[PDB]
Ligand binder design. Sequence first.
Ligand code: PGV
Ligand code: ANP
Ligand code: ANP
Ligand SMILES: OC[C@H]1O[C@H](O[C@H]2[C@H](O)[C@@H](O)[C@@H](O)O[C@@H]2CO)[C@H](O)[C@@H](O)[C@@H]1O
Ligand code: MG
Ligand code: MG
Lengths: 490, 370, 371, 286, 374
Amino acid sequence: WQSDALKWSVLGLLGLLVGYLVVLMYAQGEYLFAITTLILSSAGLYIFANRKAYAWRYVYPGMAGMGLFVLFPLVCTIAIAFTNYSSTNQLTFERAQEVLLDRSWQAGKTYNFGLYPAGDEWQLALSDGETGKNYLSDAFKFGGEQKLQLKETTAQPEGERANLRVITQNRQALSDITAILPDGNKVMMSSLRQFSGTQPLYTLDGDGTLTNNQSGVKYRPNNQIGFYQSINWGDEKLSPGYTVTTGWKNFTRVFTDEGIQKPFLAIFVWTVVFSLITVFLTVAVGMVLACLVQWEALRGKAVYRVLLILPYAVPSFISILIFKGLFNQSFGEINMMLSALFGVKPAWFSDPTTARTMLIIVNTWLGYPYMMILCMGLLKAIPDDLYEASAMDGAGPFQNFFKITLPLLIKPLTPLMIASFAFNFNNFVLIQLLTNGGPDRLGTTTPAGYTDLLVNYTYRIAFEGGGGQDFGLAAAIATLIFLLVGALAI
Amino acid sequence: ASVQLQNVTKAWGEVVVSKDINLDIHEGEFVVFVGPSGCGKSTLLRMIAGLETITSGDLFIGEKRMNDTPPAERGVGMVFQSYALYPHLSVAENMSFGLKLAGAKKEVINQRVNQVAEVLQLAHLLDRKPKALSGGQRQRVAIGRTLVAEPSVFLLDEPLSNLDAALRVQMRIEISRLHKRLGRTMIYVTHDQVEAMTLADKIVVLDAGRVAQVGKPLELYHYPADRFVAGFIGSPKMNFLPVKVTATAIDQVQVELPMPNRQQVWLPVESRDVQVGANMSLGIRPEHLLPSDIADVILEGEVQVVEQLGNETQIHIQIPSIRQNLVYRQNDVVLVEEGATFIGLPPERCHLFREDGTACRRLHKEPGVA
Amino acid sequence: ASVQLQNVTKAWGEVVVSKDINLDIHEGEFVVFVGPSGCGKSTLLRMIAGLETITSGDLFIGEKRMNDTPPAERGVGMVFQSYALYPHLSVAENMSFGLKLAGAKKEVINQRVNQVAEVLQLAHLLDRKPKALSGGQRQRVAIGRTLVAEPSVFLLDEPLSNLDAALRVQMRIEISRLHKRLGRTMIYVTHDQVEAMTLADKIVVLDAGRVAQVGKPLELYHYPADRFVAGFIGSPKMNFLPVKVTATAIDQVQVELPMPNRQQVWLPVESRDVQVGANMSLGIRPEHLLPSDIADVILEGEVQVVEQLGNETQIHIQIPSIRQNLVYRQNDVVLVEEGATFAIGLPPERCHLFREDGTACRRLHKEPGVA
Amino acid sequence: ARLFITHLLLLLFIAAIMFPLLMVVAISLRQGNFATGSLIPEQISWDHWKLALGFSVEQADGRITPPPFPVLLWLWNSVKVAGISAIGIVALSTTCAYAFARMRFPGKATLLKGMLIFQMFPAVLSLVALYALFDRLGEYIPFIGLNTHGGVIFAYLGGIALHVWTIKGYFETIDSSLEEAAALDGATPWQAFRLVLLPLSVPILAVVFILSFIAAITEVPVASLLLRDVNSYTLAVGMQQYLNPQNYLWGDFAAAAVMSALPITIVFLLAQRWLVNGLTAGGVKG
Amino acid sequence: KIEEGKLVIWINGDKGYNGLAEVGKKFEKDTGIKVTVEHPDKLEEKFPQVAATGDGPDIIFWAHDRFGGYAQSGLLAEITPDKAFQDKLYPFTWDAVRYNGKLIAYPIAVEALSLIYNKDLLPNPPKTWEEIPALDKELKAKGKSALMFNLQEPYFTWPLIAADGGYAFKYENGKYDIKDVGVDNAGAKAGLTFLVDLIKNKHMNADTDYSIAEAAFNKGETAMTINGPWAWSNIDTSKVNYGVTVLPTFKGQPSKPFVGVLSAGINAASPNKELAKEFLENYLLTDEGLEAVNKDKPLGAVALKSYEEELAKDPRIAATMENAQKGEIMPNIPQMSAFWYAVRTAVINAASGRQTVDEALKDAQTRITKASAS
Ligand SMILES: CCCCCC/C=C/CCCCCCCCCC(=O)O[C@H](COC(=O)CCCCCCCCCCCCCCC)COP(=O)(O)OC[C@@H](O)CO
Ligand SMILES: Nc1ncnc2c1ncn2[C@@H]1O[C@H](COP(=O)(O)OP(=O)(O)NP(=O)(O)O)[C@@H](O)[C@H]1O
Ligand SMILES: Nc1ncnc2c1ncn2[C@@H]1O[C@H](COP(=O)(O)OP(=O)(O)NP(=O)(O)O)[C@@H](O)[C@H]1O
Ligand SMILES: OC[C@H]1O[C@H](O[C@H]2[C@H](O)[C@@H](O)[C@@H](O)O[C@@H]2CO)[C@H](O)[C@@H](O)[C@@H]1O
Ligand SMILES: [Mg+2]
Ligand SMILES: [Mg+2]
């Protein structure tokens, strides 16, 4: 048996890292990461410290995983919902400021340059293409910020022209050189081939105002919309915009816009029904198949078993697109079979109800194996002597299913059916790949389809709908549809 | 329905649990199976039920071969040894489950559940789940479930085992009542010797998978066909003493007791296949041993164990030359202590068994047997 | 170790199954609990073992208060009424599980598992899982698992109930000899009368959650303290006849039998709280009734039921002016017909007497085997 | 009679559900890249399968085209990521479910509900938070940072809430007298968990393994976000290379899709030995 | 932080990335600067996320239309090639890479739909859309069809719709006007009415998608289809005697397919902008650099005049360039996302008979203009 002092040695070494890592995170600038690591580690060390928190030893590791990869992404999405974070306003203020101060304008001329060895030193040559004039500096050495007087020359430099390698190796020192032409114009390296009168488009003042060096227009940060705006405001705004807090703006945009509210009730009804029918058909098929495939009188059950789960073995992406091909109204093997047999060609994409029916069929095909696998395990919890008892009471298969099997499975299967409802409530992928939400609901100013779920219609407004990618709005709606799906699962 | 087993054999791989079983249970007959723990009683019951497969041989129920017939189609009900109650259903729902399947007559079902629940003394427990019950209450739910359904063949597997003695008596009478009213076949497994003797028309004694004997209760008590049956029917067990055959006559056998006095006694048993000088086993029941003052053949030893049962005293006596203690039953409280010198041996009540275990047929006619 | 229950009560909401029970179980004592199916015997065992909470009152084991002590730390092993065998483990693995959990040597494990398996006649079944066993074999595995563990306090809940008679006798001898060798406290629950009389130092009779009586085997048999105990200890049941009190002495009670002839008999029974004219219950055991030829008090009636048991004959007799049949035990095979007139003797000194409230008028006849 | 009708109705159901999958197979054996055509391709080609198995293909004009991607290495990466993360999910879920089913602690019912509810939140912006987390995590612990299998595995371990409920529910079907007998035998809550409860709950552990393995084999977004090196790709991530804005390499994608089904099939088959009836039989009378 | 002193490049996996890496090895040989080429999945989604924090590749290769969004986000450096360099590429490709009147990427390749035909079934391709119905008549008698292309996606049907006067957003003089949408006007109505009439006269079927159109043409069931350069290698393995030509005209006005310009953008956070400029201008955009990429996986038409003229010897490439020069530059503004869904829905509604041509486009424009205003 391991020593009692070793428990304090294991907790001591683990308590050594917490502190050596925490204070290390406090440096550079990782405060959010330092607070989370401390509260979580302390919780763990205390749980394993005292015997009274024994039950929490079984729960802690799993809750830490859920906190880090489920809750942390949950809180971020909600936090983003209070901001204008989007394609238009994607940068932080610091980064947006850095981008603008990096911008430049061409204030003067552009000159092709060459570098020529003058012993151990160098000479810079500039060529002016518009006047046919050439310029040559005195001998100089690389290193640090320096200025070079150039003299107009009709001659050639003595050294052989330096290749692209020498220019690249020495590019830092070369970019620190300010070259001055005889006319008085200033010129600096702007490429590996040229020097030019390129200058910064803006200058920072100190109080906060950026001023344009070409036009003279002054700009100030407008933290309400997340843009630098001209100046007490003008009308011109500068891209890139930056992320700023907007409060309830994203939330009220859903609760004010009548455009996006018109089809809400009709869409909500569909998504609720689509999810309920899926869960019902997938559980029903899943359970019946699981019962059959453990039935001892079924001679080939071990083969049937594997074949039945294969729709779940292949990634659903390719399968959904094949169903798209299968369900095609004119071509596709389903309606080509239905024309040869019954003499009918259902409007799988045109008619709303037939489209809704196709979606249910495909979702059942995709969904039943999940439920079948669940039921396969859950069935093993039912003791065999209960079926021995029911046989002695004269029960057959149908009586067994409804009197013993189903009543005993419904309780463990309830939370799984509820989670499946919530999953299918937000089944974005299946709708977008198969139907696009089609067919179209005529009249909808903010475009809505008949098979559109609340997830499809809404994300079309945030990510499509000609306003870039509105992450803040997308997050706020995600928060609203979470509150709705949590309210239904009551 | 009648129940016939013809050469029924059961093997779990190469462990033979039932061996060439032949039984003819007539319609409305009350048959009890008895035998040592693990001899094959439940297995037999479950082969009849269809809960277990038959390796070879044939089972008939009501003139139809049942080997391949699904258990629910056989017209049987069973009180399981381990009860097998439905845990998600109450007592009432457990008891009415068969009838709800057969044709839910709501009023008829309630009448029968209550009548059966009253007799089993479960009437105050009808809303209970099985987990909220005692062990013997659960047993009675198992009984009630079967008795409510009224199957054509009743199978009961040690159904009174966890009931107090007074309630056990009441149950015996109620099962007897039901058997005479319904006139249906009942196959009953028990370890209780009193249940076996009082309930059965017929008793089957099973020995490690074989039928050792079949007969009326008093037929097995007075005339056991072998050493095994003699030691199994009747508790405390028959005493067995090693003896040597000294002389054989027409209607009797003479045997020498092993004790230093070498007493010889004529026993009224059949002489067929009896050799002079053969080692035999003499049988005598504790109840049949006589007080020393009455008998001619006296047997003496040291008291080893005294058991005061109140109604009687059971005295374990170690006889010199006899390896096994002799057990003696005397009425009332007999104040004897260990280490004390202490019976009579009646020749007409002695059994005699050959080396192979088979009995020499008793010729003394006992009361109770036709 | 010793076990003490002080005012122990158990309730399932409103259903009370243990009412202020007081029991004193000394070190090395073999105590047997008896009582009707559903009276609270297992409940008590499960409260001792720590598998059930104690509503109020105090449980002591080895003089220590154990109410809130975890099951593992109680020094208690139990043979469960439902067996509770580990279904995924073999017989050997079941019986050796506790020693595996502890720091027991492999050799000691294999030693005692083998020896216990031999006396339980399970040695040929060591590699079997519980599902491949008969009900009685399973029961013996349950017993064996506890015997191998040898706890301070043995709890056994109806452990012989599914074993044949011959084997029941053998296990009974084994438990008894284990009790004498180890000298440990054993609490044994049984419905079998033979087991209770032969194994107990002391018997506890439970009645609907209450302790009805505590005493030595013969003490309960000869001197039951009330009508319940009288009718519970001894099977077939004591017969009960309604009588009227005609006279009293400190030393005896004169009662009138209910028959038309109204025969009167003096019983050697206490007259404390016995009034002339009161309606009492006379008790007489089937074994204690006499053949008619050697009796002063004669009871005559019609034979209703005859039960042939081989060793004995039990005759049920209906007597005029008595509702319940009288049961009579007779040695050997007695061939009596149903309907036949039958007479038996009623011996004054072996008669019990119970007041209206059910309490026994203490018997004063000295019976052998009781101090 | 019931056997005959079951076999026939099962076969037709099998035929109907297998049809879309045989079309996938057909796409993988069809020359060039075509999403539609006959069930048996009019022009069969082994090239898509040759390239996925590491063989070099000899094209029309004599040129030998080497396999562009290590498809088998991707498959091995998928098996490692899916296998280790399924083990981790079973480990975290069972221990968690044991406390929730057998132990008492404040707010037990609240946290259970919360677990289920918080996992139901739509993961629309989850990738941004995850990238920030693993970028930060990588500078301290390298083996679970960006561009590591460790990191991908670590990220899947949060999806346990449903498995906790599933295993909890199974735990509650097992008669409580077995763990009572264990506790009296001297077992700790850990020993009773490991030596009594887990061997009897083996069918639900198989289910949780199977479902976690499948989810991980088919997972695209998180693994694509975390993994950079081609040699570290899982198959689901690797096969995305066949998908372009205007056309798909359907043949190669289909071959990859069939391959990814193989470890799933093998895991499903191996799990059958744990998916058994009668585990609790003979234990408790009742 | 992007590492200084090297070049990390992102390009899609269907481009010649091994060829691009060879150009990188030449660059490295001449400069000492290592070039790493990567082809991550969803690189167009990954770039915005990594570039916002000041990370990601130095250079991104993708269709120009996404670069307008990137530039707006502040993720791309303004490129400054001189007049002499700009004249090396076709003038119209420079229009594809503008934002706020500033150049934000180098044009590499040019992508547009063309008319593809079976030489055995049709030696002489039609020059007009009006010639189709008559051409379908004579082929239907021989158990074939004339034209089968993707009718489900607006990208494939736009060439005809944009012919008479249809346009996505007006390109006035370097900048797009958001309120000026041309899907409602008489030009678009004329183009769609003709498409719907082909459907109504059973010359084409409404639920014909990409996969069906391609399969029918590769098996010789349809004389012609409308597809891009990406589809050529599939037709090669079919061994169908095929040709690629200019798209048919409608009402005297050429088809106007959308034009995709594979462009190379420089990350605004890169400390290697000058290295990236040199690699792009003087290594990749040479005859030798584009050849190395083309030899690995064909680019189709290219923006570099000198190399295109060498590639234009292949009639397929010449036709691609001709269609792109007569085509419409796919607008790089975020407003285009509303366009794609609205027009898709509109064509579906008119083709299936769910709406009239007039009303489908009327509600299409309404949805686009109200998405650009709010
Ligand atoms: C819409 C769903 C359609 C399902 C399509 C599935 C496709 C497969 C085609 C097969 C069609 C079934 C035909 C019936 C065949 C006879 C069944 C049979 O004879 O086989 C039975 C199988 O059970 C059984 O599914 C019993 C049969 C089930 C009862 C029939 C009711 C089905 C309707 C579903 C209702 C679900 C309730 C809603 C819950 C969400 C055998 O079981 P038992 O012997 O009792 O027990 C065996 C062991 O457990 C005992 O140890
Ligand atoms: N969980 C429960 N809730 C309510 N009542 C219960 C519960 N468990 C047991 N009982 C009742 O409590 C009483 C005592 O139970 P128990 O202690 O098992 O009796 P017992 O004396 O062991 N009978 P037996 O085992 O049949 O000889 C019975 O009447 C049960 O019905
Ligand atoms: N699956 C099995 N494999 C091998 N042997 C078995 C199996 N099931 C039962 N047995 C054995 O078969 C014999 C008969 O079992 P069973 O019929 O249950 O006995 P029983 O007579 O009912 N005994 P009991 O219930 O204790 O009075 C026993 O010795 C068992 O050990
Ligand atoms: O219900 C239809 C749905 O089923 C499957 O989705 C599973 C998913 O794979 C599991 O990981 C879990 O989250 O539950 C889901 C079911 O509720 C299919 O994968 C999916 O395609 C289908 O739409
Ligand atoms: Mg049995
Ligand atoms: Mg009990």
